[model samples]
Target chain A: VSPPPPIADEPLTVNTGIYLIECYSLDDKAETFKVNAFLSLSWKDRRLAFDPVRSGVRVKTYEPEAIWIPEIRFVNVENARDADVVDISVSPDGTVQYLERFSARVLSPLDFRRYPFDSQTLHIYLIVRSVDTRNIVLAVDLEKVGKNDDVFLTGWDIESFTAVVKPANFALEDRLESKLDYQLRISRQYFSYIPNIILPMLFILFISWTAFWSTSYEANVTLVVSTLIAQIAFNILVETNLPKTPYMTYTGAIIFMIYLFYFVAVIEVTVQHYLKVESQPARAASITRASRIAFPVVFLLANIILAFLFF
Target chain B: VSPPPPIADEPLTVNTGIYLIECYSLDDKAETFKVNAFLSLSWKDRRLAFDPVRSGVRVKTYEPEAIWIPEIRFVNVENARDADVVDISVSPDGTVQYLERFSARVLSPLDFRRYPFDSQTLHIYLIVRSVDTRNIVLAVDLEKVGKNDDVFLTGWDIESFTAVVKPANFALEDRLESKLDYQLRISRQYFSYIPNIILPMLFILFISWTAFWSTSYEANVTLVVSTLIAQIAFNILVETNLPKTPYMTYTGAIIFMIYLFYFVAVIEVTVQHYLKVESQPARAASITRASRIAFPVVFLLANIILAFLFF
Candidate 1:
């Protein structure tokens, strides 16, 4: 059960492959995902060599306790992987092929600057610690790395699952470690957000602009105040669902910009009412007429700029 | 090969089961869904019977061309099912077990009365045509009828996949036919709809009620008219996404009811203006103040009634 004897002074290269079976539970706030997949490993071990003619079998199956296997682990997992050994077969030339099905919750950071319409590259870091007896290195076997056609993640469209061909071999604590990067690329399904948040917010903001069509202080205050309260409620609801990131998101910028418009609207409403009350009817009407076009034109222009910056 | 002669006067029974593998592409407008599953068919065939001792094997494998398998078809599929035979095993007792993986687009009608908060029983109908030589009756094998844990339909929560134990036997085109039903129960992911359509529509309607707070005829007209225009825009946008159903949906009823509120709002606005012009200040104030409370109260009450009727 000791490390397999290396042929010369070279390090032992352990070929690795991962085939995804099920992918689910992608949590936006936690930046975590759950994966179920089959991991395949292969290496040469002269200690288990045998003649196929004498054994009367081309391959021999062995239990984990009966042979040595590379002690592999995931670097970015929440906990120890839940794995079940599927098969371990050794060929006549002592080439060992190992397969295991494992389920793991992976921890991967997400960038939300573009959010809602963002795409993410999720990673599963596979690693192995090199033993004192022999240095172990990792490698990718392209043939066996794949994902099932039925594999799915809710609220996301899975683009691809691939592994970096070259392994990252580095030293840690004066000992060598081999690491492999498995990437799953996915994009968010953002179609539902338009009617849900964007259009609703826009509708309320436009509703606030109706004050320009009237000269009543009471009605202008009611319109502006009620719409602001609704916008505040919407902001609270939206913040509750989204993760609080240090950087601003595309939607967050637009949402924050709305408060400025509301503040200016209150100012305009006050100025118009005060002027009319002070026997300045002509001045108040002029400002009101100009605002009817200004508010909508400025709002539309700001949106176009925000969309261009994000997209 | 021909079907085995039945014992006495009994019809041959072909036990049927379906196991779901993948479920996707649920199109609401077309009332259709795509499915990938395993179909298992079992029947007793004395012609394929053999002694285990003489054959030295408990089961024998045969190709489809060499076996007398029942010709089964789907009744409600858009076209012929795409199938690939996986295995055909015959046991010592002459029980033939057949398994095939098939992909099909199923046509199942949907009821949109509850709309975004709806649950549906999607069906896959399995049927066998009676041949001139024998009448094959269908029976359910519950043991093999299930769905994979990983099977997912986007934007839906899968509740269960089950088969009805009894088969519907009836004459079709003067020939006896046996049919089995496999059901997939699912409920809509209604969380998105609340923010998307319901709350947004409510916000606009509530914004319109602000007209009651003012005495100015111009302001009241602007408030009611502009809000009505926005509401119309929302209605047009909403109708574009949903299918045209004969009956009113829960959301549909609420949407249609909103027009009545806006119409009455305009009437109140006109009535207040006319009263003010006639110097009936007391009457105008009384109706305006009463409306502030009546509009919100009636809206809330009607919504409660609609929810009670739908839920």
Candidate 2:
């Protein structure tokens, strides 16, 4: 009915492990994912011990209601996990082996500074509360902790699933608590984004530079204004896909720099038109020729700097 | 060790159900997905029959090796499923219950005709091989067949997870086999594609039309040629995201048609240059004036037709 008394003047160590069955639904905006795994717990209970020869059976199955099971819970879960106890077996020496299957939506914060080209270590914190009768401490069983081979999170490359091994021992609300950290390392699948977002954006920027090849003010005005509007539409579309972050992301910096390029193109076009109208065709032609080379070179250099800074 | 002997002349029916615990990694290119689920199977074994009153236990547990378990296999899996037997329980009247947790990469084909706007029915084919002593037939238990509420496939809307209820009974290798279809209906999340691919592509095509408003042959050449190159870049980018198919997809049709528009624009530009060089300024200006209205109207009408055909 209560915690098992410690064998010595020390906390009872409950060996624990989490074997991941499935990992899915990684939400960037919500910073969450759904996980299905098997939680295994083992501990010794002296009161239930028996001699193998006397009991006849080396292992005995016990209902959860008849056994003392630890009140283990997840700290980072959205709500309590939906868990089903699979089995409970007690050895002749009263070593209890407990297994349960549980599924939960875990809330783990994500860093979006590099987003879409980001790698993250998602955490699942398992914790147990110490009772008044005795203190409980958690320990990882390395042999039992692992992931299914077929476990996959769509659009992500799962790098590793591991536990920290050492529990974070602390006192919470005057009760001794121990927590274990389970980490799932993953990186985004960025192949689709290059063609879908990055290349298209670069293509639009290059097309806008063609304005420097012409001397017609009306033509230049149409070219610059149309591309600028297109850039604005892309910005709006890109923003909708990502969460609003206080710090700029890699793609965000590039997209914002594009608006500056568009504005600068407008200025040059306006200056060239003014010079042409004021009887300075010589000066107007010089600026137009210089711009033909300057725009692309500066754009390329800026992108290199942005990439270097982010990487 | 062997199947139970038939009480009568009927074939043995193994009532089966699959409860999906997690569904993830629906790979578009490979036409596969990884799944984790509980496979429930029930059959009657008369050899294991015992009187409940005499035995003093309503239910008895037996190792999978100690009882007869049908060798169930997945027909559409990349490899044989990795399964671990959870429990095998027997009732007084010889009714046996079996449960196992399995993970497998299911090989189900996908139709990309609609592509980002597509809906797919992913299949998991469950099959049982008949033994020489008695034929084995599979049946679905509707009550036990379902998916976990938290089951999710990323970037998709899961419409339903259902079994066909009817088994396909056929001969294979001179043995009777029963196959069941487990379907997972899903629709692509098209919100990202609209902004990332479709709209950006449309913007490039629209920008090419700006040449119609200009009379200067050189300015028109710069406008149309630059945009044509940009369109080519978009075309190449779009192809990488999808698999090569014999038939045209909705997006593919539109992308191919845009190439024709670009070629026509080049012809119009060439003609305008020819007319102006011949001192036929009035004719060249007249042709340019007509094109501003014609290109956009034709593009809109063609898109409407394409959408009608695809949807």
Candidate 3:
């Protein structure tokens, strides 16, 4: 093992006909090299013309200079609406090269006005090839193209790629788009609906406080069971709408907190009911009244604080 | 206007290859055509290699035999252990052709061992060339490429393409190989430690039953507060180790149940104490005796049931 080779110099960008060349060092021992060459857009005139600046144009790689030859060529066509001929090229000295002949269609001005930029998809073809051996490494980047005023272009990263020839003349469809929209809309709708859930809980808690006034132990037991059922039902409903995400949602935390309070209340009601049944002679109205006020106040404060921290 | 095109007779399999093709409608009335493409794999090899199979592939549209050619290609190199390449081509007669190439040197065997059973990244490059029109689409898929013993291949649908070139020539030091041992060691250590957290919780729940023996209200209050604190602390510790999931974890549910039981114990103790103070003459000794026996039996049974459900 020779001492690890020195890091290779940065790659040179080049525009070659049919693809772009990006050359980079594959190993610290500069013996190995890599090139990521991709197709040019001038060739793809009808399929993808939109805002060129906003389309995420990125440099694919920086590798050894030996693998890419930068050169360009022109091809002529007949009967298309646009110009009949296009230019293509590859760079000779640069570490990176682009094949100019294989450009995708940039959306025309008229097409952009018709679509109005709600959502658009763009596909990019990159044929990474070795300049030294003419060996090719083909990759594709399928981006969900978008335009935002803040950022010049908007899109997620590449979706897929291949090195060998696969079927051509085929189109790809979006599956996640509908599901993503559904999830977002449901989340938004639930935000407005939460106040309704909160109001009923408050009323039930008030009713629970009235358990203290129950002259009979049976009435107190009835109230506690009813309150427990309500809290459990609310918890189940909230859980149904949310995905089983790793992180707790705001709604989940709130529901859990309410369940905890309800459990405490159940114990309170049960104990009070037992005391009344046993007919304790000393009259415990003061203690019950104090607890009735304190339990709700303390739980309410704790919940509010917990909500603040979680949300 | 033209009739919808006939679906292709070809069955596509995902391995290492390339293909080309054209689509033309036989009927003149159909305005738009839809085609579905899926990459199927055989899981003959037992070692689960490759990512999960994704649905769908590329789609495209074109005018009548204004010929369209699509190609998918794979590269083959000697001694390089990278993914094989697949390419497709579309001739003028609507014939779809495929080419398969192998590149053994693009990825090393050592690289494959590091991500054993991991999916290979594929790039899908689509080119549509007519007499005077040209279009290109690029897509990517990360699919599993199983070992020979567990032969499995998977593919994902392509989404969109791009024209932007990526930077090149930069390489990073390999750190992944060294970290594998550390991951395995940690996994082994945790298998034993998880049971420790569980046993302590059961012990605490049993100790909570002792609250029934304490007669004084102050002592009951102290017991409840201290147990609540301990349970809460345990909850925090369990949560720290677990993912913050929306759904309840076994640990979290157990803690919550324990807390509820403890709350019941506190309320029972307080109520009993109050009853004794009030009915000083008739029921004090009897109440204590009933609680001592009943509390232990009831709570122990509850614990057994809860434990069974959780397990």
Best by lDDT: 1
Categorize the docking of model 1. Answer: incorrect
Clashing pairs in 1: A196-B196
Highest DockQ among the candidates is held by which one?
2
Candidate 1 on B1-311: residue-level lDDT in tens? 77899898889999888977667667777899887677889999998899989887787767799898898999999987878675577889899988876778999889889887888999899999989888899998878788766565655789999888889999999899999988999997754465445655665676667677666777667667766765665555445445588789887888878998999999999998899999998999899889989888998899899999899
CAPRI accuracy category, model 3 = incorrect
Q: Looking at model 1 chain B, which ten-residue stretch has the lowest summed lDDT? A: B234-243
Model 1 lDDT tens row, A60-81: 9999999988878776665457
> Can you tell me the DockQ of model 2?
0.08
Mark the regions of model 1 whose C-alpha exceeds 4 Å error after superposition: A1-114, A117-183, A186-311
After superposition, candidate 2 runs with Cα above 4 Å error: A237-240, B1-41, B45-93, B96-311
* Clash count list over all predictions: 1, 0, 173
Candidate 2 iRMSD in angstroms: 9.6
lDDT of 2 by residue, A1-311 (tens): 97778888899889898887667666777889887777889999988888989777677767799999999999999886977675577877889888776778999999888877889999999999998889999999887788866576655788998999989999999999999999999987655465446655665566567667667677677767765665555454444455577779888888889889999999999999999999999999899899988898998899999999999
